[PDB]
Amino acid sequence: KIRPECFELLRVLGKGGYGKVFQVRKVTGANTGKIFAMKVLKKAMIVRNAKDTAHTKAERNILEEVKHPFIVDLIYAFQTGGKLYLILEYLSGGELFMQLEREGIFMEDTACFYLAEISMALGHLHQKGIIYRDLKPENIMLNHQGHVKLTDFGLCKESIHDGTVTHTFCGTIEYMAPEILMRSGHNRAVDWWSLGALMYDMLTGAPPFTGENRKKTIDKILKCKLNLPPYLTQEARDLLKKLLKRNAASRLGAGPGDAGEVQAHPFFRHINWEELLARKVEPPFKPL
């Protein structure tokens, strides 16, 4: 029976209003010395609010069901009287955010690699009926080899919250689909929008609808007047045009084919999907 005492704490990886993440190593038994990330949530901070309770249980249910190389792996999960524990794989490659900052602009082949892996993760989720919604550079980590991992399926990680009712808009909203910000109803097509926004950011240096402040950003996102810079390749321009459509049902990937439709686009013409999913493709950046 796994317990908190089975793990030795090595450092604090992060913290927020609901709990903390530690780097840990297993003290004894199987995988003695194996390194994990341990997320520890305070039930007291959660159980009084039906929405947060629900969100917590959905996080654990999603992470338990998902079996995919490009989504964070949940190893153990247990609780005590006052805390919930999630033992996750430790991801040493950092945030994709740090990669965009260091490079400014990705070469197309580098962008293509990361966007391809993300699309496979989104496809896995979508066929399970799960919508990611929060695709953004900060949310995308890299393992020690440099492969993509999607994270943040649970409670709010922000230190400053937007309003007092929901945590839906606490982060940057620069990658969020217009129909979410409009509260006009949405489905898995929001993820293909977010993929486009991320792609635009990789290849230009900034998300497509940024402004001087948040209001102006939201206004631009809702207005949806896409300007594609001339230096984009024909394949990139074409895909971005198809992903960043205001009308969800027109978006590439919104169709019945979902990720399959996006993956069939000429921007991804050189991707071998079997070798990619099997992690046999050398990543563009190696955290080593």
Ligand SMILES: NS(=O)(=O)c1ccc(NC(=O)COC(=O)c2c3c(nc4ccccc24)CCCCC3)cc1
């Ligand atoms: N809602 S809350 O309890 O209050 C709350 C929970 C977590 C955070 N902050 C984070 O999770 C930050 O990211 C991580 O902690 C993190 C991680 C990992 N691996 C990491 C490796 C290095 C550095 C951080 C890592 C392993 C992969 C999963 C993500 C964690 C802030 C607030």
Ligand SMILES: [Zn+2]
């Ligand atoms: Zn919040």
